[PDB]
Design an enzyme around this catalytic site. Structure first.
Site, mmCIF file in Angstrom:
data_model
loop_
_atom_site.group_PDB
_atom_site.id
_atom_site.type_symbol
_atom_site.label_atom_id
_atom_site.label_comp_id
_atom_site.label_asym_id
_atom_site.label_seq_id
_atom_site.Cartn_x
_atom_site.Cartn_y
_atom_site.Cartn_z
ATOM 1 N N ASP A 79 1.064 -1.469 -0.173
ATOM 2 C CA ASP A 79 -0.261 0.072 0.131
ATOM 3 C C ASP A 79 1.077 1.675 -0.027
ATOM 4 O OD1 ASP A 79 -2.275 1.211 -0.150
ATOM 5 O OD2 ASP A 79 -2.478 0.967 2.265
ATOM 6 N N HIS A 86 -4.147 3.800 -6.982
ATOM 7 C CA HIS A 86 -5.247 3.545 -6.053
ATOM 8 C C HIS A 86 -6.756 3.093 -7.127
ATOM 9 C CE1 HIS A 86 -3.741 3.183 -2.861
ATOM 10 N NE2 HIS A 86 -4.265 3.166 -1.884
ATOM 11 N N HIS A 145 -6.553 -0.687 -8.109
ATOM 12 C CA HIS A 145 -6.883 -1.411 -7.510
ATOM 13 C C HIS A 145 -8.373 -1.357 -7.348
ATOM 14 C CE1 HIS A 145 -9.069 -1.339 -3.385
ATOM 15 N NE2 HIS A 145 -8.123 -2.662 -2.742
ATOM 16 N N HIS A 177 -5.526 -5.561 0.364
ATOM 17 C CA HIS A 177 -5.899 -4.135 -0.005
ATOM 18 C C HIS A 177 -4.170 -3.983 -0.662
ATOM 19 C CE1 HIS A 177 -6.707 -0.035 -0.533
ATOM 20 N NE2 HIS A 177 -5.903 0.443 -0.252
#
Ligand code: NA
Ligand code: NA
Ligand code: NA
Ligand code: NA
Ligand code: NA
Ligand SMILES: [Zn+2]
Ligand SMILES: [Zn+2]
Ligand SMILES: [Zn+2]
Ligand SMILES: [Zn+2]
Ligand SMILES: [Zn+2]
Ligand SMILES: [Zn+2]
Ligand SMILES: [Zn+2]
Ligand SMILES: [Zn+2]
Ligand SMILES: [Zn+2]
Ligand SMILES: [Zn+2]
Lengths: 363, 367, 367, 363, 363
Positions: free
Chosen positions: E168, E251, E254, E268
């Site tokens: 992340d 992101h 993602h 994540h």
């Protein structure tokens, strides 16, 4: 005094043999040509045809692979009234041509058909005993008048001989820099000029830049610019470097190795290459520089261990004898900028072997 | 296509070398004509004849009449023949040395040159430069072999006026730039072939030695003494430059020097002073970067070489005079055609006029 | 989303190119109207008509009345139609060239431009800049194609006053900074798309050539001659800058230039002089590091370009005048919105006033 | 004189085919469209729909894979009164479109569906004999008016064709720098500008930065920024570079290779890549630069040995014939800044093969 | 406006749980503690004992792995009159603690027992549908008052969770620099400060310096200085970076991947890592930077191919759906400094997969 000496003229290029008459003519109008039968077969019509084109008289002498072949060729020269000597071929021939020219006081033109040592430009011949052991450096009062390197002929000779010439040339920078540091007297008879030291360094730099590229060209029998640069390196750069800048531990170690029967099958330059490695240990060169020289020797096929030199088993006493001989009074190893003893030489050689064997393991 | 390098047989240098000349000369001959003018005989004669005597070398002194002309050459030839000499020694300045080369050439005997100044790279070369009587470049005259031996006594040289050392550094300064230009053009040198790697590297080593050692050597010679820096510069001005220019090549700077010989305003500046400016003009001709021009301007200014037309005696509306310089530099057969590009008189005029401007702007910043 | 690069068909440069114009012009047409004012005809007319004649190219000279106006354009159009010309040649300065582009556009014929000065990057572009009669920027006028051929005679250019070469270097100076700003913003160029890599690289090459060659070229042109440095700068001021700005992009510097056209104090400085200062102001607007500002200040000062408001004729309490410059530079449609960030009049005023201060402090250190 | 030439407009991007009408309209209101049936199937509705949207008339001609297909399309053009030519497809089509446009004196718009050579921007077509041997460079007086590169179409073409275009583009810097050094005249007819040389260099730098990344995208059939950069490199940068800066040994060696039947199955750019390698040997580039070009060729799939080119066994006489042909009078190899002879070329080629084969061994 | 926001206090160190009472006391004298039974077992006596030592009242609530667990905990809070919320545990717990604190307007103290995302410092919770698909970013008006990271607890959690937190954190520099370049508005509501961008960069530099070293420590269950630096990187540096500097393509990609069932088993941060790689392709980062990120991901165990993400076979249409979703109106991918379309995203993803698979082959 700083002193540099040189042949009067160095000429190099592809088919340079076909242009010889124009340069030889400037020195004399009548030559004795010394060459073996195989070299006469390869080079003789080209050469004799060049000499004829420029009005140069020539007589070829029967030559075979001793101060007495020299005397015999001396008398034959007088008999035909020759004004000049041309040597064509490998080292023994060129050495005989220099000797004859010297004893008769005539100009000499050398035409090497291989590029395997830096001897041709020099005023020097190395004498060996009957059993192959180094005897002495014989210094003549003059350099050759002219050296002619035909690159097409050289690039057709066995690649192993180009590699040997690179091994001889590998020592030149290292030996010259050690002498320079020591303020040693060269064979030219003074301290080194800047010029000689710098050609010695250019020699090393050229080998690193062009060695592999040249080897690959010569494996195919052809002349590229890399080959021309290595021939120059092996012959002019190395020759000026060693004679006018100086010899040191690598050549003295080579001479030491001549006392072992086991190494008589290697070329002069293959043994000088390992002698260079031993010198790197003797002078404590940094590992990075050892690595560079190990990778270069391995890359072109020069020996980096005692086994590659034919010395097997427990070599300790054999290498003691090599070290005693490399340290004889008179030897060039005493031109190092530090004191050297047999024990230190034996240690450098044995350690260099370990370093070369560890390198082989990693590769 | 052939690469060729030629060289004097032996080059010898060091402090008080004159006193050791007999060992080396003996190896070539046991009997010499010694050519020297009177000033040089008074300076060097007792040491030299002393050395020769001490090694069993016979010698007849001959008074040189200052000029290198066929008359003096033919005269000295006859004199040699009459005492039976088997070798020539030249001692002193350029005209004495060029005369000794010719005498040895015509008599086919070995020659030892002993320069008493290091102001040009002539001594080692198989060459003489012929001018007119009005001082105007005539021809390169080329011998078929180099002098046998060149002996540089550094103690003598370091007592000669500093201006002569500077002029030799000026001549040496052009060597790298002309050699590298020829190399790039694949031009043929005066040795008769393409340049070896050896001759080019000596030429570069010349430039690099001048930059490292030139100021230090100048300072020592101003004090009348020999340091290692002086030994290096003398090698650079003599052996490095001499092999570099003969076996590697001449190009624009020497052609521009030759072209300047048509102007009276310059005619008494030393050869190397003019060649230094000709080097600057070569830098503009080949478009060297500004950093390299700066380096050369700072070197010439720091040792006392000219960097403007006014320092060469040329002022006013020199448009026409520089066009005359430019035409002469581009004559058929001149070395400027060895540049790796086409050169015209207009381009040469441009490079000269522009070099003057660069050097004048540099002078205004003083540094 | 589309990347587009456009270009004149052929760009030709070199010393005495005017004398070779006939071979190249012949390939497009065998009959030309030649538009030139009287001064230019006297300077270049015999060489040009000579070249054209020698290649069998027919030509009618037409006297240009100095201004690029619809009247003169419509007039020259009629004249062309009446002799049956199949091509236009423009020779001289910007207004002559812009007129020839328009004539060729309206008549739909091929055009050869021969600039006799290298003071702006206009010649290669499919563009004309319209002002008011009071000298105030009006509009970019855009043609649908580039000139067919642009011919730069470097010998002619090097005899023109050095101030015009400097002004062209000033215009060229903005090219990299505006192109890279547009590139960063993904802005659309005047060629109608995003910039190619090619147009950006030419723009960078422009900046790098100015830094390497600008002083050397200035010195040569002060002497009236052409060196390689001059050849490089002329390419930089003309081809590199012209493709860079048209196909890569305009941004703050040219918008700021346009904004300065509302002040009478500047109105007679050359376009490139003003653009140089506008480039400085762009550096402050985008917050270039100090080292890059220093480099540009030293370049502008070294060749003679303005680095303060006072060198542009502006003094006193210029707060209100610079706010007027700033408003005009930010008008709708101006190129300053091609910056990779939001620009307001207040930010532009800030950048200008601050650039002035930087350049004034630099002047006080002299260097 | 320094001279640079260019097409009037180069346009590139994804789905650029759907925007063609807007640019083509500026040149003419009626085109002849030359394309084969497969290209018409892929591109024809998109193109014809764009032309219609901008009020451009169009007639499509039956085209099949000769000065006589050119004459036939010449007459058909007059018959329908067309004011313009569009070529769509691979090289033969684009070459035919340039020829027609030239003989009819009309504007031409080229739309390459592959990015496999640098030919499209140029005023040049390469002519070959019936047996595939290089014949001549045919120079037209104008460049194309417009070149349109649709990246989406190109990225869907076989990756081997993008790779070939990179092999052609690989030669551009090396050839241009050699000509520049030699002060050679380009096909544009003068000395090189700074601009052309610089685009040639940008070409090489782009290949090294983007080549692999682009190849990986095109293997998946997609357009990333790396693909756009390589298409530009392969087409605009290379095209300006070669025509306005110059050709030299690499292309002359390619032309030489066309005399061997064994290589007719390689694309133009695959052979130019090896020709580039041979040139690196001819000019004695440093080993580091040889390594960079060997690693790049290997990384993308260009040939680095004579065996990868289909030349096996003792190649010595075959490569002699390649070298004789690459040195013909007129050939571009004489734009090198040094004299070149057949023997030197044969040596460069044979050595390059050895260098490429040694590299393969290490990898 | 440039705007930076932050929690009021971030505290980190080994056994920081035993010092919580001293900091929590400064905010309130009575807390609701939200934690699951497993976390209560690990952390509860330590925490409750700290709270007691500093005169802080506490009530623990039964919490289980919805706006309605939030409402229920809301009522329980009022019932006992609590003045404060402490969340202890993984993300769902911390998110529930932020929601409760917000709806009740009380201070919140967060105590993460894993370091697996950068969420804890932020005023943000990410909402997903029942099927695991990204729904929306929910922005709260305040950041948490306090974040406490006990490194001893974190270093005992499964290493795979530290690795996920690094994945992340890997995106943070790249996303922040893209937003900065684009002049995009962050979630903090302005342009980025220098401060936020710089912490984002420090985040990346720390990962490269400490990532491996920390992973090796956490594999043995222990805390070294490298672990403390990565926890800080994963939590404070990344959290400030992403919220105050900005989110971008990684992101958004993602979020796109959440529309495929095949990837729901990855954390994540594992998916953000590949999304970062895709972004590197989208923005055409240089190969050297791609290599650095590929080597780092491989070295710590983050996915570098679609197969490592559970996406096998012909993925082309699946990745088209991921790309459509990553480009929805509102998504952060439009903060890139260039226009982005689904086709470009699909191309970046597919190419990144090829680059990661080629890298695996070489290793
Ligand atoms: Na040696
Ligand atoms: Na010189
Ligand atoms: Na501009
Ligand atoms: Na090419
Ligand atoms: Na992040
Ligand atoms: Zn005989
Ligand atoms: Zn030896
Ligand atoms: Zn005598
Ligand atoms: Zn000189
Ligand atoms: Zn007319
Ligand atoms: Zn402008
Ligand atoms: Zn039609
Ligand atoms: Zn090609
Ligand atoms: Zn409570
Ligand atoms: Zn995240």
């Amino acid at each position: 005094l700083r002193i540099i000496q040189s042949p009067g003229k160095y000429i190099q290029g592809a088919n340079a043999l076909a242009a010889v008459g124009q340069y030889a003519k400037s020195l004399a109008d009548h030559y004795l040509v010394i060459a073996d039968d195989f070299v006469m077969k390869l080079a003789g019509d080209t050469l004799m045809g060049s000499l004829q084109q420029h009005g140069v008289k020539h007589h070829a002498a029967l030559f075979n692979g001793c101060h007495k072949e020299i005397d015999r060729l001396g008398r034959e020269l007088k008999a035909h009234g020759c004004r000049g000597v041309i040597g064509v071929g490998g080292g023994k021939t060129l050495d005989t041509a220099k000797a004859i020219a010297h004893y008769q006081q005539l100009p000499v033109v050398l035409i090497p058909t291989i590029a395997s040592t830096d001897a041709p430009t020099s005023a020097l011949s190395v004498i060996y005993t009957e059993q192959g052991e180094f005897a002495e450096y014989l210094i003549y009062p003059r350099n050759p008048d002219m050296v002619v390197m035909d690159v097409a002929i050289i690039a057709k000779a066995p690649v192993r001989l180009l590699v040997a010439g690179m091994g001889d040339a590998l020592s030149t920078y290292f030996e010259a820099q050690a002498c320079f540091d020591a303020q040693a007297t060269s064979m030219a008879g003074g301290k080194s000029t800047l010029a000689a030291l710098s050609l010695a360094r250019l020699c090393y730099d050229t080998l690193l830049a062009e060695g592999v590229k040249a080897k690959l060209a010569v494996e195919a029998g052809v002349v590229t610019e890399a080959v021309e640069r290595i021939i120059e390196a092996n012959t002019y750069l190395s020759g000026i470097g060693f004679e006018s800048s100086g010899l040191a531990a690598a050549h003295a170690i080579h001479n030491g190795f001549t006392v072992l029967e086991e190494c008589h099958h290697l070329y002069h330059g293959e043994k000088v290459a390992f002698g260079t490695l031993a010198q790197l240990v003797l002078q404590n060169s940094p590992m990075a520089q050892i690595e560079t020289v190990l990778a270069f020797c391995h890359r072109i096929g020069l020996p980096i261990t005692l086994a590659e030199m034919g010395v097997s088993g427990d070599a300790v006493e054999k290498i003691m004898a090599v070290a005693q001989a490399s340290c004889a009074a008179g030897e060039t190893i005493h031109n190092m900028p530090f004191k050297v003893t047999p024990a230190g030489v034996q240690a450098a050689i044995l350690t260099a072997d370990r370093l070369g064997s560890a390198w082989l393991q990693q590769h």
